[PDB]
Nucleic acid binder design. Structure first.
Length: 51
RNA sequence: AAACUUUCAACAACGGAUCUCUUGGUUCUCGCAUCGAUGAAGAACGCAGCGAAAUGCGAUACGUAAUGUGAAUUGCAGAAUUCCGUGAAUCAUCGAAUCUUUGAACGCACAUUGCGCCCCUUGGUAUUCCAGGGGGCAUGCCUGUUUGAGCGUCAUU
């Protein structure tokens, strides 16, 4: 089990309700993968140009 | 030493690089089907108060009518407009018009702005003729229509 996260209201006040961490926040933070995937994905929304 | 030649610097010249811009181009994607014998695409001759191209237009000639907008156009000159409205405008829209000479080009022609024919015709008595206005007369082929022709076939006391 994880620490747990407090949910705030629209007035910016800590409501008594708490939520468990989804365990995606316990994934490996990989800067090298994010870089080598982003560079390929940022190329996709791109048009052709030609002389 | 000056001049002269050369080098550097400053200020002028010459040239249009660099920077920045951009009513342009190129490429990709999406949608739609829309030229012409009712005479197109194209060529020519013209047309605005003052015009080169461009753009627009055809003797109704950078337009006429219609509909909307609502008060300009403006390079210059000059007109306007009752502006509480049938109405300014090189405005927008665009369905009605005109639409020169040509061009598939179509009366006959060759490269003749000639050579004509018929219909309708207002004028110069127009019965003679003369002039003006307006629409037609190409080829092939289809559906007809019509005057025919054909010992092409048959009928016929």
């Amino acid at each position: 089990s994880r620490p747990q996260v407090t949910v705030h209201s629209l007035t910016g006040e800590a409501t008594a309700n708490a939520l468990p961490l989804p365990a995606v926040f316990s994934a490996p933070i990989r800067p090298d993968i994010v870089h080598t995937v982003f560079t390929s994905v940022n190329k996709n929304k791109r048009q052709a140009y030609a002389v």
